[PDB]
Amino acid sequence: IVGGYTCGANTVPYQVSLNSGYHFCGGSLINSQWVVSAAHCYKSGIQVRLGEDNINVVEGNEQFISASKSIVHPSYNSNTLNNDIMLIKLKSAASLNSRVASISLPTSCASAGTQCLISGWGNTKSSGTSYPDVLKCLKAPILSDSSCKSAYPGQITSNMFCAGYLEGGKDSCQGDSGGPVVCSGKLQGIVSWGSGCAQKNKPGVYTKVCNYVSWIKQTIASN
Numbered sequence: 500i501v502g503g504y505t506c507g508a509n510t511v512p513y514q515v516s517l518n519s520g521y522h523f524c525g526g527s528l529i530n531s532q533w534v535v536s537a538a539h540c541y542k543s544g545i546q547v548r549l550g551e552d553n554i555n556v557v558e559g560n561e562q563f564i565s566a567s568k569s570i571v572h573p574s575y576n577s578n579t580l581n582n583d584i585m586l587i588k589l590k591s592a593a594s595l596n597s598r599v600a601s602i603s604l605p606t607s608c609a610s611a612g613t614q615c616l617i618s619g620w621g622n623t624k625s626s627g628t629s630y631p632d633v634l635k636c637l638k639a640p641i642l643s644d645s646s647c648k649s650a651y652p653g654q655i656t657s658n659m660f661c662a663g664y665l666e667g668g669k670d671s672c673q674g675d676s677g678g679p680v681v682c683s684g685k686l687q688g689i690v691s692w693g694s695g696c697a698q699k700n701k702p703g704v705y706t707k708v709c710n711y712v713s714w715i716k717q718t719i720a721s722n
């Protein structure tokens with residue numbers, strides 16, 4: 500997260516770190532046995548780490564659970580990143596409490612202007628790599644479809660939305676992919692891609708979760 504602030508330990512209880520010996524992506528806990536992340540974060544050997552703040556220190560509240568299966572959306576396109584969503588089923592359910600909680604899926608899509616919270620352990624520099632130990636947060640608004648399409652002509656599908664600041668300075672970045680974009684208590688997006696990080700007129704692009712709720716529900720109900 501570039502231009503954000505330190506969240507404060509366990510203030511984002513639905514945030515998870517996907518780990519394979521190092522942190523490579525974020526994700527969101529939506530119930531006690533399922534996590535939603537981005538399809539491009541898929542790999543084998545995933546350990547899901549819940550209740551984290553400093554990802555390099557066991558401070559207490561952590562729960563490390565292996566993924567039993569990861570379900571990449573069947574129409575995921577790795578060239579356009581269209582349908583960049585994945586569901587991960589945990590080997591055992593997690594113990595929910597005030598430090599580990601799930602986030603609700605939305606019933607409707609959000610409108611431009613909506614203020615959301617984006618978080619993660621990704622790079623905090625736009626020009627260079629500085630990875631934090633604790634979780635960073637950024638409050639950012641959803642942009643209108645026209646500004647998004649004018650920024651990325653021909654690359655935005657109906658399953659994506661832009662959020663951020665066109666003046667540059669604040670954005671999600673590498674290491675944040677797969678994580679949450681929460682607006683009014685509902686998970687509206689998943690960190691997907693962007694051109695550089697925090698560059699002028701190149702906002703972050705997110706997977707539009709409201710378009711996949713029936714798919715998430717039906718898939719979880721059958722697995």
Ligand SMILES: NC(=[NH2+])c1ccc2[nH]c(-c3cccc(-c4ccccc4)c3[O-])cc2c1
Binds near residue numbers: 524675692696704
């Ligand atoms: N400007 C943004 N808003 C933004 C958001 C998420 C991002 N993720 C990345 C990213 C960069 C290199 C590798 C990965 C990656 C690749 C495979 C698996 C996991 C992460 C990224 O997600 C860049 C990147 C940029």
Ligand SMILES: [Ca+2]
Binds near residue numbers: 552554
């Ligand atoms: Ca820790």
Ligand SMILES: [Cl-]
Binds near residue numbers: 652
């Ligand atoms: Cl277009």
